[PDB]
């Protein structure tokens, strides 16, 4: 049953993300859209996540399975980094509207994407090199915690997801004050004009974005830290069979939040 | 001054335009149809050319 | 006295109307009834030219049916190679508001134009290899909407001051002025023999001009709004117009009156361009709803569509041998159909 | 054929050399802001143009603000019909509409209102924003504060009008002058706020021809236009 | 050809009533928004009122509000302007300009350079 569920999830991820990728590629051919490169990269990263998840369907071998787990981890890291890139792009557009037009370019987008993938696949395969992250006493069956020690996930949490979330929250909270001020000015002018003759939109959008970002990997990193702290607790059965699927199912949600919710990307898909 | 100038110029132009000869609509349509029929076979957009001679294929 | 002139003009208009009514005896639709319909036309995009930074306003084919020139909002004149798609020139204009472009029949010149009340002449055959500006013709008091070549030393230009003009490029001076329009002159077309030209002028009337003498030989009315485009029939004895009331009309020089109307209820946009095929059997129009239509010139039916653009179609063009048609658009792309 | 190969290679080389310069030009085109200046003979648009600068069919002005480049295009030497050459300005960030508020009755104010309404509702200018300058404030104040000129004669609704709640009168100004100013501003806002679309807005200011803050106002309004565009794009506004 | 002919002018004592009319031909009347303008001696042309295609978006100028009324009948292609309680300031020539194009919500039809789709005019005078 677990393998059946994994196969279904991988199929859905592959199909949706590939469809979104081709739609975005057609839109990029038509227009210029320097900000659609990041959406295309996100779709590619999510479909690669799906393929990697499909890779593990065999067992459901130490080196073979130490190389599969690294691939899956690198895919997840790339997907997490692309969303941060998108968020910084939006924040720089809003906060510095003139300098953004004066600086941003396809060369910058391509260089950033190359660096993204390089860092992602460095992070994926660091544990295979650093001796502390690696575990010992292999039994014959493989899993994320049969190769990689919980110290690896602790380090990832300390230097990764949580410092990233502290920025994903600050940016989208500073982008709310500006929208509030603009809405106030618009409402004032509208009232004046009407006399002469949306109040919970930005908050809703920001809440959806922040919840989607934060509910993906935090239940896994927190439980890994709990495992590191408490030795008596046997938090492996739930830690590598139930709490891992949320950060993977975030790949089903990302296309709906960064592709379908765009007006030009919904029209192109309808034309397709 | 300007108004009378405009009126007189318009009157002269209208007179000169009225002093012309006209052909019948049936004859004009026959001539147009004859031209289109005579030159029908030299129109690639009407009769598509084989892909060998097409330079945009 | 003035009222007498007005009444005499009204009487002359009545006389002309009576004469035209007398001349008509049967409709073009009745005449071309038994002719078999063309069937259906399905052209396909063979090329797509990229390189303009903004919306395209004009394009003109070359006499060899291979090269073409285009003008854009970005202030650039580009000379393409239709077969291979490799750019051959990119001339930077001094103004970004350009409404028309033309290519000399020899192929050694191009003409710019626009809202600065000038169309310039650029030499493409400089020994140094640099496309410099040769002549700058001034004298119009409103924007320029057409600037077409007669030979390497004669250009006929339309203007937004209600007058057309004929220039001799060598000394850069006018030679004739064509007055009589009340609105803005919006298009132009030279006769195949290059002895007469027509023009629609934003007052819902087209005219016939004699280049040699400089007088209005005929006036054609029947449109309800501004006339945007005008083309000559292949044999030189008729022409087609396109206006903002969403219809096209065919006029005959000899009969002196309209012959047919190309319209449909579903169409409520304005015609931006019109062009004839090599044999004159097809009339192609580009509309404001991002599509072009293919009309049967003799039957009045609709035969096809050129649906490949995502913004306003602003220009049209058929080659001098009927090999293909081009269409620019506001989405910045030139497309070639076959 | 070797000759054909040589010709094709030279053609590709020329195409690449052209593409490079087009790529260089795209950035300069994208990092520049174009503005259309409208108005009338009565309105002091000439003086505003002079302040910004401190048979040609169009005049061009270039000014720089904090390393940002603006291009202001002033139409001159054209006939009085507008429905044709007004479509050449579809892709400008803003229109600077200068209207003299001290010119009520010919009904110059009504003519300006009609022009604003037509421009606002045009079909190729349905995503452009207007930076409305209400000029000749000093003349308006001088005329209203002393004289028999009554606005209600030409704008009968002015009788039943009182200063809005959000008014910010300049300390040292008469209530009558403030009421007249805000009545004219509300008259101009009644047209624009009635669209109910969200793709363009109006930015009114109370200006004098010799004001030194007009370029700063244009800069700030362009910044607001771009910020609002992006916020609306990202589903926040 | 576009034709607009206005009639129903003359001389009226102050405080009287009048009714101008205009007949149109050569175009579809029901697809365009009609309009009235005027030009007093020594002054330029000025817009008076206008009405939509269906006839449900009327609007007047400030100085005629309440007195004048504009009504169009699309079954006969006619336009009317009922004037009530005239004053000496209403002495001018009244034209019947028309929308430049159909189906639009725009208008540029007051131009000094003779607007093509404007009528010839009818004289209205108010004196004691
Ligand atoms: C660098 C920083 C900015 C950053 N950004 O994102 C992140 N990510 C990195 C990856 C995330 C964890 O990824 C995993 C963990 C485990 C598993 C897994 C578990 C069980 C099995 S099984 C059933 O076969 O035994 C198979 C795989 N998959 C992916 C954490 C945060 N860091």
PDB file of N, CA, C and O in Angstrom, chain C residues 104-148:
ATOM      1  N   UNK C 104      12.124  51.432 -51.941  1.00  0.00           N
ATOM      2  CA  UNK C 104      12.183  51.871 -53.324  1.00  0.00           C
ATOM      3  C   UNK C 104      12.044  50.682 -54.274  1.00  0.00           C
ATOM      4  O   UNK C 104      12.483  49.571 -53.961  1.00  0.00           O
ATOM      5  N   UNK C 105      11.436  50.887 -55.448  1.00  0.00           N
ATOM      6  CA  UNK C 105      11.338  49.776 -56.411  1.00  0.00           C
ATOM      7  C   UNK C 105      12.691  49.244 -56.845  1.00  0.00           C
ATOM      8  O   UNK C 105      12.811  48.051 -57.145  1.00  0.00           O
ATOM      9  N   UNK C 106      13.715  50.100 -56.898  1.00  0.00           N
ATOM     10  CA  UNK C 106      15.060  49.622 -57.198  1.00  0.00           C
ATOM     11  C   UNK C 106      15.614  48.779 -56.057  1.00  0.00           C
ATOM     12  O   UNK C 106      16.253  47.748 -56.295  1.00  0.00           O
ATOM     13  N   UNK C 107      15.375  49.196 -54.817  1.00  0.00           N
ATOM     14  CA  UNK C 107      15.880  48.481 -53.663  1.00  0.00           C
ATOM     15  C   UNK C 107      17.062  49.172 -53.018  1.00  0.00           C
ATOM     16  O   UNK C 107      17.770  48.572 -52.205  1.00  0.00           O
ATOM     17  N   UNK C 108      17.288  50.437 -53.375  1.00  0.00           N
ATOM     18  CA  UNK C 108      18.416  51.205 -52.863  1.00  0.00           C
ATOM     19  C   UNK C 108      18.007  52.257 -51.842  1.00  0.00           C
ATOM     20  O   UNK C 108      18.854  53.052 -51.424  1.00  0.00           O
ATOM     21  N   UNK C 109      16.740  52.295 -51.430  1.00  0.00           N
ATOM     22  CA  UNK C 109      16.279  53.315 -50.500  1.00  0.00           C
ATOM     23  C   UNK C 109      15.134  52.767 -49.666  1.00  0.00           C
ATOM     24  O   UNK C 109      14.469  51.798 -50.040  1.00  0.00           O
ATOM     25  N   UNK C 110      14.924  53.401 -48.515  1.00  0.00           N
ATOM     26  CA  UNK C 110      13.738  53.201 -47.692  1.00  0.00           C
ATOM     27  C   UNK C 110      13.311  54.563 -47.163  1.00  0.00           C
ATOM     28  O   UNK C 110      14.120  55.494 -47.103  1.00  0.00           O
ATOM     29  N   UNK C 111      12.038  54.683 -46.790  1.00  0.00           N
ATOM     30  CA  UNK C 111      11.466  55.941 -46.316  1.00  0.00           C
ATOM     31  C   UNK C 111      10.820  55.720 -44.953  1.00  0.00           C
ATOM     32  O   UNK C 111      10.046  54.776 -44.773  1.00  0.00           O
ATOM     33  N   UNK C 112      11.154  56.583 -44.000  1.00  0.00           N
ATOM     34  CA  UNK C 112      10.557  56.580 -42.669  1.00  0.00           C
ATOM     35  C   UNK C 112       9.394  57.576 -42.650  1.00  0.00           C
ATOM     36  O   UNK C 112       8.911  58.009 -43.697  1.00  0.00           O
ATOM     37  N   UNK C 113       8.897  57.924 -41.471  1.00  0.00           N
ATOM     38  CA  UNK C 113       7.859  58.935 -41.367  1.00  0.00           C
ATOM     39  C   UNK C 113       7.342  59.005 -39.949  1.00  0.00           C
ATOM     40  O   UNK C 113       7.881  58.369 -39.041  1.00  0.00           O
ATOM     41  N   UNK C 114       6.301  59.800 -39.759  1.00  0.00           N
ATOM     42  CA  UNK C 114       5.571  59.775 -38.507  1.00  0.00           C
ATOM     43  C   UNK C 114       5.203  61.161 -38.015  1.00  0.00           C
ATOM     44  O   UNK C 114       5.190  62.136 -38.759  1.00  0.00           O
ATOM     45  N   UNK C 115       4.919  61.217 -36.709  1.00  0.00           N
ATOM     46  CA  UNK C 115       4.314  62.360 -36.025  1.00  0.00           C
ATOM     47  C   UNK C 115       5.189  63.605 -36.001  1.00  0.00           C
ATOM     48  O   UNK C 115       4.740  64.624 -35.471  1.00  0.00           O
ATOM     49  N   UNK C 116       6.407  63.564 -36.528  1.00  0.00           N
ATOM     50  CA  UNK C 116       7.263  64.741 -36.576  1.00  0.00           C
ATOM     51  C   UNK C 116       7.092  65.543 -37.864  1.00  0.00           C
ATOM     52  O   UNK C 116       7.829  66.512 -38.076  1.00  0.00           O
ATOM     53  N   UNK C 117       6.137  65.166 -38.718  1.00  0.00           N
ATOM     54  CA  UNK C 117       5.800  65.918 -39.929  1.00  0.00           C
ATOM     55  C   UNK C 117       6.890  65.800 -40.992  1.00  0.00           C
ATOM     56  O   UNK C 117       7.133  66.738 -41.751  1.00  0.00           O
ATOM     57  N   UNK C 118       7.539  64.638 -41.061  1.00  0.00           N
ATOM     58  CA  UNK C 118       8.629  64.399 -42.000  1.00  0.00           C
ATOM     59  C   UNK C 118       8.648  62.916 -42.337  1.00  0.00           C
ATOM     60  O   UNK C 118       8.341  62.073 -41.491  1.00  0.00           O
ATOM     61  N   UNK C 119       9.001  62.594 -43.583  1.00  0.00           N
ATOM     62  CA  UNK C 119       9.508  61.269 -43.923  1.00  0.00           C
ATOM     63  C   UNK C 119      10.902  61.431 -44.506  1.00  0.00           C
ATOM     64  O   UNK C 119      11.105  62.215 -45.437  1.00  0.00           O
ATOM     65  N   UNK C 120      11.858  60.703 -43.937  1.00  0.00           N
ATOM     66  CA  UNK C 120      13.255  60.764 -44.334  1.00  0.00           C
ATOM     67  C   UNK C 120      13.555  59.670 -45.348  1.00  0.00           C
ATOM     68  O   UNK C 120      12.794  58.713 -45.506  1.00  0.00           O
ATOM     69  N   UNK C 121      14.679  59.824 -46.040  1.00  0.00           N
ATOM     70  CA  UNK C 121      15.137  58.867 -47.041  1.00  0.00           C
ATOM     71  C   UNK C 121      16.511  58.370 -46.621  1.00  0.00           C
ATOM     72  O   UNK C 121      17.411  59.175 -46.352  1.00  0.00           O
ATOM     73  N   UNK C 122      16.672  57.050 -46.564  1.00  0.00           N
ATOM     74  CA  UNK C 122      17.904  56.415 -46.119  1.00  0.00           C
ATOM     75  C   UNK C 122      18.540  55.649 -47.271  1.00  0.00           C
ATOM     76  O   UNK C 122      17.857  54.900 -47.976  1.00  0.00           O
ATOM     77  N   UNK C 123      19.845  55.830 -47.447  1.00  0.00           N
ATOM     78  CA  UNK C 123      20.589  55.199 -48.529  1.00  0.00           C
ATOM     79  C   UNK C 123      21.145  53.863 -48.054  1.00  0.00           C
ATOM     80  O   UNK C 123      21.998  53.824 -47.163  1.00  0.00           O
ATOM     81  N   UNK C 124      20.666  52.771 -48.648  1.00  0.00           N
ATOM     82  CA  UNK C 124      21.106  51.435 -48.272  1.00  0.00           C
ATOM     83  C   UNK C 124      22.351  50.976 -49.019  1.00  0.00           C
ATOM     84  O   UNK C 124      22.931  49.953 -48.646  1.00  0.00           O
ATOM     85  N   UNK C 125      22.776  51.696 -50.054  1.00  0.00           N
ATOM     86  CA  UNK C 125      23.874  51.272 -50.916  1.00  0.00           C
ATOM     87  C   UNK C 125      25.079  52.198 -50.792  1.00  0.00           C
ATOM     88  O   UNK C 125      25.751  52.503 -51.777  1.00  0.00           O
ATOM     89  N   UNK C 126      25.365  52.656 -49.577  1.00  0.00           N
ATOM     90  CA  UNK C 126      26.551  53.468 -49.352  1.00  0.00           C
ATOM     91  C   UNK C 126      27.808  52.620 -49.516  1.00  0.00           C
ATOM     92  O   UNK C 126      27.853  51.461 -49.098  1.00  0.00           O
ATOM     93  N   UNK C 127      28.835  53.209 -50.131  1.00  0.00           N
ATOM     94  CA  UNK C 127      30.088  52.487 -50.320  1.00  0.00           C
ATOM     95  C   UNK C 127      30.709  52.108 -48.981  1.00  0.00           C
ATOM     96  O   UNK C 127      31.228  50.998 -48.820  1.00  0.00           O
ATOM     97  N   UNK C 128      30.663  53.019 -48.006  1.00  0.00           N
ATOM     98  CA  UNK C 128      31.231  52.735 -46.693  1.00  0.00           C
ATOM     99  C   UNK C 128      30.508  51.596 -45.988  1.00  0.00           C
ATOM    100  O   UNK C 128      31.048  51.035 -45.029  1.00  0.00           O
ATOM    101  N   UNK C 129      29.305  51.244 -46.435  1.00  0.00           N
ATOM    102  CA  UNK C 129      28.516  50.219 -45.784  1.00  0.00           C
ATOM    103  C   UNK C 129      27.640  50.708 -44.654  1.00  0.00           C
ATOM    104  O   UNK C 129      27.011  49.884 -43.981  1.00  0.00           O
ATOM    105  N   UNK C 130      27.576  52.017 -44.424  1.00  0.00           N
ATOM    106  CA  UNK C 130      26.769  52.592 -43.358  1.00  0.00           C
ATOM    107  C   UNK C 130      25.501  53.196 -43.945  1.00  0.00           C
ATOM    108  O   UNK C 130      25.562  53.951 -44.921  1.00  0.00           O
ATOM    109  N   UNK C 131      24.359  52.862 -43.349  1.00  0.00           N
ATOM    110  CA  UNK C 131      23.059  53.326 -43.825  1.00  0.00           C
ATOM    111  C   UNK C 131      22.835  54.723 -43.253  1.00  0.00           C
ATOM    112  O   UNK C 131      22.334  54.875 -42.139  1.00  0.00           O
ATOM    113  N   UNK C 132      23.204  55.746 -44.015  1.00  0.00           N
ATOM    114  CA  UNK C 132      23.047  57.133 -43.609  1.00  0.00           C
ATOM    115  C   UNK C 132      21.765  57.717 -44.192  1.00  0.00           C
ATOM    116  O   UNK C 132      21.187  57.186 -45.143  1.00  0.00           O
ATOM    117  N   UNK C 133      21.328  58.828 -43.608  1.00  0.00           N
ATOM    118  CA  UNK C 133      20.142  59.538 -44.069  1.00  0.00           C
ATOM    119  C   UNK C 133      20.547  60.471 -45.203  1.00  0.00           C
ATOM    120  O   UNK C 133      21.485  61.265 -45.065  1.00  0.00           O
ATOM    121  N   UNK C 134      19.847  60.367 -46.332  1.00  0.00           N
ATOM    122  CA  UNK C 134      20.188  61.142 -47.517  1.00  0.00           C
ATOM    123  C   UNK C 134      19.409  62.451 -47.592  1.00  0.00           C
ATOM    124  O   UNK C 134      20.009  63.526 -47.694  1.00  0.00           O
ATOM    125  N   UNK C 135      18.080  62.380 -47.541  1.00  0.00           N
ATOM    126  CA  UNK C 135      17.230  63.552 -47.677  1.00  0.00           C
ATOM    127  C   UNK C 135      16.193  63.577 -46.565  1.00  0.00           C
ATOM    128  O   UNK C 135      15.733  62.534 -46.097  1.00  0.00           O
ATOM    129  N   UNK C 136      15.831  64.790 -46.150  1.00  0.00           N
ATOM    130  CA  UNK C 136      14.801  65.014 -45.141  1.00  0.00           C
ATOM    131  C   UNK C 136      13.820  66.034 -45.702  1.00  0.00           C
ATOM    132  O   UNK C 136      14.169  67.207 -45.866  1.00  0.00           O
ATOM    133  N   UNK C 137      12.600  65.591 -45.992  1.00  0.00           N
ATOM    134  CA  UNK C 137      11.615  66.402 -46.695  1.00  0.00           C
ATOM    135  C   UNK C 137      10.626  66.989 -45.695  1.00  0.00           C
ATOM    136  O   UNK C 137       9.863  66.251 -45.063  1.00  0.00           O
ATOM    137  N   UNK C 138      10.631  68.314 -45.573  1.00  0.00           N
ATOM    138  CA  UNK C 138       9.759  69.039 -44.664  1.00  0.00           C
ATOM    139  C   UNK C 138       8.806  69.923 -45.457  1.00  0.00           C
ATOM    140  O   UNK C 138       9.072  70.283 -46.606  1.00  0.00           O
ATOM    141  N   UNK C 139       7.690  70.280 -44.826  1.00  0.00           N
ATOM    142  CA  UNK C 139       6.711  71.134 -45.470  1.00  0.00           C
ATOM    143  C   UNK C 139       5.271  70.829 -45.112  1.00  0.00           C
ATOM    144  O   UNK C 139       4.394  71.673 -45.307  1.00  0.00           O
ATOM    145  N   UNK C 140       5.009  69.632 -44.597  1.00  0.00           N
ATOM    146  CA  UNK C 140       3.679  69.301 -44.106  1.00  0.00           C
ATOM    147  C   UNK C 140       3.479  69.899 -42.721  1.00  0.00           C
ATOM    148  O   UNK C 140       4.416  69.971 -41.921  1.00  0.00           O
ATOM    149  N   UNK C 141       2.253  70.338 -42.440  1.00  0.00           N
ATOM    150  CA  UNK C 141       1.917  70.961 -41.165  1.00  0.00           C
ATOM    151  C   UNK C 141       1.173  70.018 -40.230  1.00  0.00           C
ATOM    152  O   UNK C 141       0.627  70.464 -39.219  1.00  0.00           O
ATOM    153  N   UNK C 142       1.136  68.727 -40.548  1.00  0.00           N
ATOM    154  CA  UNK C 142       0.553  67.732 -39.673  1.00  0.00           C
ATOM    155  C   UNK C 142       1.319  66.441 -39.834  1.00  0.00           C
ATOM    156  O   UNK C 142       2.200  66.324 -40.685  1.00  0.00           O
ATOM    157  N   UNK C 143       0.971  65.461 -39.008  1.00  0.00           N
ATOM    158  CA  UNK C 143       1.702  64.205 -39.030  1.00  0.00           C
ATOM    159  C   UNK C 143       1.638  63.580 -40.420  1.00  0.00           C
ATOM    160  O   UNK C 143       0.830  63.960 -41.268  1.00  0.00           O
ATOM    161  N   UNK C 144       2.614  62.700 -40.698  1.00  0.00           N
ATOM    162  CA  UNK C 144       2.706  61.993 -42.002  1.00  0.00           C
ATOM    163  C   UNK C 144       2.168  60.577 -41.809  1.00  0.00           C
ATOM    164  O   UNK C 144       2.587  59.932 -40.826  1.00  0.00           O
ATOM    165  N   UNK C 145       1.289  60.120 -42.702  1.00  0.00           N
ATOM    166  CA  UNK C 145       0.667  58.806 -42.631  1.00  0.00           C
ATOM    167  C   UNK C 145       1.002  57.889 -43.800  1.00  0.00           C
ATOM    168  O   UNK C 145       0.656  56.705 -43.748  1.00  0.00           O
ATOM    169  N   UNK C 146       1.652  58.398 -44.846  1.00  0.00           N
ATOM    170  CA  UNK C 146       2.126  57.571 -45.947  1.00  0.00           C
ATOM    171  C   UNK C 146       3.228  58.317 -46.686  1.00  0.00           C
ATOM    172  O   UNK C 146       3.209  59.546 -46.777  1.00  0.00           O
ATOM    173  N   UNK C 147       4.201  57.556 -47.193  1.00  0.00           N
ATOM    174  CA  UNK C 147       5.324  58.113 -47.949  1.00  0.00           C
ATOM    175  C   UNK C 147       5.757  57.014 -48.917  1.00  0.00           C
ATOM    176  O   UNK C 147       6.540  56.139 -48.540  1.00  0.00           O
ATOM    177  N   UNK C 148       5.247  57.061 -50.153  1.00  0.00           N
ATOM    178  CA  UNK C 148       5.445  55.998 -51.135  1.00  0.00           C
ATOM    179  C   UNK C 148       6.283  56.487 -52.310  1.00  0.00           C
ATOM    180  O   UNK C 148       6.212  57.655 -52.702  1.00  0.00           O
TER     181      UNK C 148
END
